[PDB]
Each structure stands twice: as C-alpha cells, then as structure tokens.
Amino acid sequence: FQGAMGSRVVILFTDIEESTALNERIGDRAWVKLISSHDKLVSDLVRRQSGHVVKSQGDGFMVAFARPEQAVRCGIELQRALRRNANREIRVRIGIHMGRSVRRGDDLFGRNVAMAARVAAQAAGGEILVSQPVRDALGIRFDDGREVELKGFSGTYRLFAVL
Amino acid sequence: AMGSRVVILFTDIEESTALNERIGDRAWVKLISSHDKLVSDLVRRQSGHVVKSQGDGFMVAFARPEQAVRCGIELQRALRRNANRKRHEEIRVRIGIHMGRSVRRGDDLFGRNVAMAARVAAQAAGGEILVSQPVRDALSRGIRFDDGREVELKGFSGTYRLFAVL
Numbered sequence: 551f552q553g554a555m556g557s558r559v560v561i562l563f564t565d566i567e568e569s570t571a572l573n574e575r576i577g578d579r580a581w582v583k584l585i586s587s588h589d590k591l592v593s594d595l596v597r598r599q600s601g602h603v604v605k606s607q608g609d610g611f612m613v614a615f616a617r618p619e620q621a622v623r624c625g626i627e628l629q630r631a632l633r634r635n636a637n638r639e640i641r642v643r644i645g646i647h648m649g650r651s652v653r654r655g656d657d658l659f660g661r662n663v664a665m666a667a668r669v670a671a672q673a674a675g676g677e678i679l680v681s682q683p684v685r686d687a688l689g690i691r692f693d694d695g696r697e698v699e700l701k702g703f704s705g706t707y708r709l710f711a712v713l
Numbered sequence: 714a715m716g717s718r719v720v721i722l723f724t725d726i727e728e729s730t731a732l733n734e735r736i737g738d739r740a741w742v743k744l745i746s747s748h749d750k751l752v753s754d755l756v757r758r759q760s761g762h763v764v765k766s767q768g769d770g771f772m773v774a775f776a777r778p779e780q781a782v783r784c785g786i787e788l789q790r791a792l793r794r795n796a797n798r799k800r801h802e803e804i805r806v807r808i809g810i811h812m813g814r815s816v817r818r819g820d821d822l823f824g825r826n827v828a829m830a831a832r833v834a835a836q837a838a839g840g841e842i843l844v845s846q847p848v849r850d851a852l853s854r855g856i857r858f859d860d861g862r863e864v865e866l867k868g869f870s871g872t873y874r875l876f877a878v879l
C-alpha cells in the first residue's frame with residue numbers, strides 16, 4: 551500500500567519494576583552485575599525467538615519480532631526465567647503490540663511504537679499485556695481483557711494478560 | 714555511586730504521542746529526524762556525546778556541567794525560534810541535568826546517578842532546563858538559576874532541590 555509508511559512489526563517492551571529503588575538498595579556495583587546478567591538473558595531469549603533487540607532503556611529493552619507468537623513466547627520464557635531465578639526477585643512488566651512502524655537504521659518510529667510502550671507501561675510487574683491485534687492474531691492462554699485509556703491516544707483499548 | 718565522574722543530560726519531548734497521532738507517521742518521522750539532527754549538532758558544539766535515542770528524546774554525556782547547560786540553553790532557544798517561524802510543528806522539550814559517578818559499560822552508563830538524571834528531566838516542564846544541586850553548585854563561578862524547588866523523586870529516599878536555568 552503506497553499510502554503506508556512502514557512495515558508490519560511486533561514490538562515488545564520490557565521494564566523492571568522499581569529498578570531505581572533496587573539500584574539504591576544494592577549499590578551500583580551490584581546493579582551493574584544484575585543488569586548485565588539480565589541483558590544476557592533477554593538477549594538470548596530474543597535470539598531463540600528470532601527477534602532483534604533494538605535498544606536498552608536502562609532497566610529494560612525494546613525488541614522487534616516478525617510474528618506475534620514469537621514475541622509472546624519470548625515474554626512467557628522471560629517471566630518463567632525471572633521466577634526461576636528468584637527462588638535462588640526482579641519483577642518485569644512486558645507489553646506487546648503489532649502494526650506498521652517506520653524503520654530508520656536499527657530503530658523504529660511511529661504511533662505503533664508509542665502504543666507498544668504504553669501497553670508495557672500498563673502491565674504490572676510479573677505480567678505480560680498484549681493489545682487486541684496481538685490477542686486476535688493468537689498453546690497460549692489469555693484473560694478476558696480490560697478496557698484502558700493510553701497516554702497520548704484517544705478512545706479506549708482492550709489489553710489482554712497472558713495467563 | 715561508582716564509576717567515572719560524568720554529566721548526564723536527558724531531553725524528552727512533551728506529549729509526543731499526541732503529536733504523532735495528530736500529524737501522522739510520515740510527518741512525525743520527518744520531525745524527529747530534523748530534531749535528531751539539531752540535537753546532535755548542538756551536542757557536538759559543546760563536546761558532548763549522545764549515548765542513545767529514546768524515540769522523542771536523547772541521553773547525552775558531557776565532561777563538564779557548563780557544556781551540558783550551554784547545550785540545553787542553545788536547544789531551548791532553537792526550539793522556540795523554530796516554533797515561532799513554523800519551521801516545524803511546535804515541540805516543547807523537557808531537559809534534566811545531573812552529575813556524578815556512573816559506570817561505563819559498553820557505550821552506555823549505569824547506576825543511581827543515571828536514574829537521578831532521568832528523574833530530574835522528568836520533573837522539568839516543557840521548555841525548562843532543570844538541574845540537580847551538584848550541577849547548580851558546580852557552576853557557582855553568565856548562567857543564572859532560580860532559587861530551586863524541593864521535590865521527591867521516585868525510587869530515591871531523599872528530598873532533592875532542583876534548579877531551573879533562567
């Protein structure tokens with residue numbers, strides 16, 4: 551479609567809950583070790599689901615996938631790993647959305663990138679939220695969804711938690 | 714706090730999502746590409762280094778607080794002058810500046826002072842440059858500041874006095 555800027559991509563954001571407080575409690579040396587380990591785990595899981603880490607945001611990542619099932623499986627695997635590690639507790643919120651986005655270098659721009667970020671911002675620590683398009687596109691179980699408004703967007707959006 | 718002393722500046726466009734929605738992706742990408750070019754130019758003029766882009770804003774490192782503050786002043790000026798001439802859609806940008814030790818890892822920066830700089834920027838109004846007390850105090854010797862405001866910052870136990878550039 552000529553009027554369409556940008557190509558379809560699934561965008562996933564992760565974000566550690568209360569990372570600043572954690573950093574203050576454990577100190578910078580321990581924080582650097584922690585985020586280094588976390589980066590490696592996330593990187594490895596993304597690679598397993600054929601995604602690409604676009605960038606780090608300090609205590610989380612922006613990630614691109616071709617298919618929604620890849621992004622959701624990556625999220626499920628990360629949450630499972632964070633739970634496993636805590637029984638030796640970093641909590642992460644994950645949001646997933648899909649739509650056209652504009653590529654510039656390795657980065658992605660446009661309203662669907664913003665949407666993915668707000669879906670993630672809506673998620674509780676330990677939760678994976680996905681937008682309706684992702685839910686509709688998808689051995690994965692979802693809740694019945696919840697209506698929310700997102701910062702910068704008009705109207706309401708139904709977001710679905712992975713169960 | 715660990716690592717080498719550095720000044721950290723964050724920029725962030727106010728309500729960029731609403732703007733993107735209003736003008737559409739074609740216009741947004743043109744705007745953000747032009748904004749990136751402007752910021753990159755001003756950063757280079759003050760010997761700074763852009764660490765990363767965060768969509769509608771940048772994380773920038775400087776050796777000296779005067780460089781970071783001069784950069785913020787030049788940016789706010791350019792943005793106001795550009796908006797006044799309809800050079801691009803009006804954008805208002807928040808700017809926060811903090812200094813202290815942070816850990817280098819690759820080309821990124823980590824630690825509580827990075828988080829502090831991000832929170833200082835988050836407190837700034839669109840069109841404002843807010844700096845932490847160490848930055849204000851470091852410039853005590855043609856840059857003027859207000860009398861500061863005391864604020865709580867998420868994730869920090871303290872109360873912190875933040876100063877706007879006048």
Ligand SMILES: C[C@H]1O[C@@H](n2cnc3c(N)ncnc32)C[C@@H]1OP(=O)(O)OP(=O)(O)OP(=O)(O)O
Pocket residue numbers: 565566567568569570571606607608609772821822823824827828829831832867868
């Ligand atoms: C205070 C903000 O600092 C961000 N931050 C830390 N290091 C970096 C970095 N190297 N690059 C970019 N950003 C960085 C992450 C942190 O933002 P939040 O995730 O909003 O803070 P926090 O995790 O404390 O609170 P919540 O996520 O629970 O809201």
Ligand SMILES: C[C@H]1O[C@@H](n2cnc3c(N)ncnc32)C[C@@H]1OP(=O)(O)OP(=O)(O)OP(=O)(O)O
Pocket residue numbers: 612657658659660663664665667668701702725726727728729730731766767768769
């Ligand atoms: C909704 C979130 O999407 C962020 N965003 C958009 N594109 C990118 C990108 N390529 N890389 C990283 N982040 C991106 C910016 C936006 O976050 P905010 O700046 O908090 O949104 P907004 O400008 O609407 O809110 P305020 O700055 O007014 O709080």
Ligand SMILES: [Cl-]
Pocket residue numbers: 668671672699700701
């Ligand atoms: Cl939101």
Ligand SMILES: [Cl-]
Pocket residue numbers: 793794797
């Ligand atoms: Cl003017």
Ligand SMILES: [Mn+2]
Pocket residue numbers: 565566567568569609
């Ligand atoms: Mn966080």
Ligand SMILES: [Mn+2]
Pocket residue numbers: 725726727728729769
């Ligand atoms: Mn913004």
